[PDB]
Design a binder for this molecule. Structure first.
Ligand SMILES: NC(=O)c1ccc[n+]([C@@H]2O[C@H](COP(=O)([O-])OP(=O)(O)OC[C@H]3O[C@@H](n4cnc5c(N)ncnc54)[C@H](O)[C@@H]3O)[C@@H](O)[C@H]2O)c1
Ligand SMILES: NC(=O)c1ccc[n+]([C@@H]2O[C@H](COP(=O)([O-])OP(=O)(O)OC[C@H]3O[C@@H](n4cnc5c(N)ncnc54)[C@H](O)[C@@H]3O)[C@@H](O)[C@H]2O)c1
Ligand SMILES: [Cl-]
Ligand SMILES: [Cl-]
Ligand SMILES: [Mg+2]
Ligand SMILES: [Zn+2]
Ligand SMILES: [Zn+2]
Ligand SMILES: [Zn+2]
Ligand SMILES: [Zn+2]
Lengths: 377, 377
């Protein structure tokens, strides 16, 4: 290789501080240490989670840092000990790691690996406790263990899903977070049964993925809820049978849903990050057995509340992280399902832009005018 | 019966108004109307739910009424169209009805029948909207559809479980309330798996039932929690492996439980009715997959709260009503199970008193060190 074992200077987008636009400039990327993989990002999308940390809403937010966590790329080089990937492998770096040996990797119902979170949560690497990015010798920190807003990033081996080398990297970049989360919320967390009724709160890429998955699960009714009705036509494309704007009703939205379904929907999904809506989604879960799945990420500190009578009379409050998918094991399975022609993944990409316009993409998502914006270098 | 078709003069305990003692006196019990059943009560227990309504705290409280909801007895006569029981059958009347045709009776994960609940909640019968008790020709209202503090009571057919004629009625009287509820919270709601860890908050009859069922399910560790340490010895006999008094510790009790189990317990149960402790039970459920079952009934105007991060990181919040048991279907199975010698049901009866002493029995309940006290006439 031409770059293996040596630093790489490449284009990236740095967040020097919160609530400021990113600076697209050159950074230096160190070679991978033991158990690490240096990846050449080929495509990367913006998620609402990136704007969440950029807006100062992350308690563990550490600046300066390279954001980004929805990407697909090619292995440029690996550090010593790395056996699972090799240069040339097509990969998807995942915020959720997989070690196969911790208690959560071994449990059938969890994907919350603890192999590297103590370091990825701090924006550093496990091998030496430091980051791999510098600018004029000063350290720039990692984000969600991925930091995909850079031509080359360095990640832990446990965070690297090896995927079908023939899958288009600018489409499956979405499988690193949002769309996978919405799908697994249906298939893994809720396990929607055929015939069921569903309510989805928030119609971004995540909520639309809940709708697509619930459709595929055989749901007989899917109520799409959003305060922005310009997202309704796409929601009906994915399979929504009803679209509801909360601002068209003086009743609370959970009362509206209950009246449409007498007792509530068998499953409800919150895909916003609004604690008042999370409460609403649980209270319009069906009496006796309804399930509500929190998908959105609320601002740190905020609390959800309900009357305990809601759970005593049969409703179930749960949440999901990355759809319950064990990353390195199951992300390749999602790529395989994409390559089989069975998904609507291509429909989630509303804009393809160059990496230099990353800030316009952030304005697109703050304005609700995009689903997923895929950046290429 | 030579009482069939006729009113019956029998002894009962009348609650004329709130916060005053019951009067033990004769009452007139009308014959059973269409779809109604008249039961000779052979044994009836007390619990805190009776004392809650008697104390004037119940917003649905209706006086004068006849309290009592834990009982077993024999059918004296049946009203028009009743075929599920006949005179002489041994029965348990249940607050939780089963009609076998509404949405909830037909769902495998619910037992919240709506056949008669709107009428029992108002202390009247469904056939005509009127009660069946009179003193001096003026009406006495029912309680929880059972009104078991009476030698004879009239109940809806949907509330009448038909049980093994061989079962002792002064023991199976408990199967209509807290013991079944705690058992079912484990077997039906949580579905506690073999080898799992369990935490129980509150060590009355309900929590002790949770402990007994969890041990029977194969739980490898059972942590009993109560601010009254005098409940610990009995918690250990039912199968507790640890006992924790929250007041002995200077950290939040959920942090105590998590430190004892590194990540939390696989299952936790709130058996008190305390929203603060409900949140504590949720937050010491195991990371990634822990389940917390609210069993206790909180006071009015109280809400449960947590940070949604707790659910996004894999914890599940649910509740139970009557342990999820479909009453007329499954209460007979609980009796059969008790007759098999598999349960500690007899160990929940700490006191046996005569019905004339009902007021003294209530004072024992208010003092404590009484799990269940059974009254016979
Ligand atoms: N649990 C996880 O692992 C995970 C993974 C990825 C994303 N998320 C979170 O899920 C959420 C959705 O992600 P996204 O990319 O689709 O964001 P998005 O901004 O593209 O979509 C959110 C939608 O919610 C709508 N909305 C806002 N407030 C509303 C309200 N009161 N009522 C109804 N609709 C409302 C908005 O109009 C918007 O269309 C985000 O909070 C994200 O952080 C969680
Ligand atoms: N879901 C149902 O269908 C159903 C059925 C029956 C009873 N319940 C409810 O279950 C609950 C328990 O029933 P019970 O008969 O055992 O009542 P109980 O009063 O006999 O037992 C309550 C126990 O909780 C302990 N306790 C009180 N506050 C505590 C605290 N902060 N921390 C730890 N322990 C505390 C008390 O010391 C006591 O031992 C009640 O709320 C009851 O209404 C529900
Ligand atoms: Cl938080
Ligand atoms: Cl799919
Ligand atoms: Mg993720
Ligand atoms: Zn792991
Ligand atoms: Zn994301
Ligand atoms: Zn009771
Ligand atoms: Zn019913």
């Amino acid at each position: 290789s031409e770059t293996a074992g040596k630093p790489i200077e490449c284009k990236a987008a740095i967040a020097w501080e919160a609530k400021k636009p990113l600076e697209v400039r050159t950074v230096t990327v160190a070679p991978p240490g033991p158990g690490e993989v240096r990846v050449q990002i080929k495509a990367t999308a913006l998620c609402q989670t990136d704007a969440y940390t950029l807006g100062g809403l992350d308690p563990e937010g550490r600046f300066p840092c390279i954001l980004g966590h929805e990407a697909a790329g090619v292995v440029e080089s690996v550090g010593e000990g790395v056996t699972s990937v090799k240069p040339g492998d097509h990969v998807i770096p995942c915020y959720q790691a997989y070690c196969g040996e911790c208690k959560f990797c071994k449990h059938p119902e969890s994907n919350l690996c603890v192999s590297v979170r103590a370091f990825t949560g701090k924006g550093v690497m496990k091998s030496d406790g430091k980051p791999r990015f510098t600018v004029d010798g000063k350290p720039i920190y990692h984000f969600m263990g991925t930091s995909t807003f850079s031509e080359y990033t360095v990640v832990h081996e446990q965070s690297v899903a090896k995927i079908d080398v023939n899958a288009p990297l600018d489409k499956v970049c979405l499988l690193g977070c949002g769309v996978s989360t919405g799908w697994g919320a249906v298939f893994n967390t809720a396990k929607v049964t055929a015939g069921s009724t569903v309510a989805v709160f928030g119609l971004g890429a995540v909520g639309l993925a809940v709708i697509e998955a619930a459709k595929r699960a055989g749901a007989s009714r899917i109520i799409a809820v959003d305060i922005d009705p310009t997202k309704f036509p796409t929601a009906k494309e994915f399979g929504a049978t009803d679209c509801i704007n909360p601002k068209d009703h003086e009743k609370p939205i959970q009362q509206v849903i209950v009246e449409m379904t007498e007792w509530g929907c068998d499953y409800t999904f919150e895909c916003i990050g609004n604690t008042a809506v999370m409460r609403a989604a649980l209270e319009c879960a069906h009496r006796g057995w309804g399930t509500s799945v929190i998908v959105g990420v609320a601002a740190a500190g905020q609390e959800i509340s309900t009357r305990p009578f809601q759970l005593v009379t049969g409703r179930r409050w749960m949440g999901t992280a990355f759809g319950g998918y064990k990353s390195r094991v199951q992300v390749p399975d999602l790529v395989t399902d994409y390559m089989s022609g069975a998904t609507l993944l291509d429909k989630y990409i509303t804009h393809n832009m160059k990496f230099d316009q990353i800030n316009e993409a952030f304005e697109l998502l703050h304005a609700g005018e995009c689903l997923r914006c895929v950046l290429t270098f």
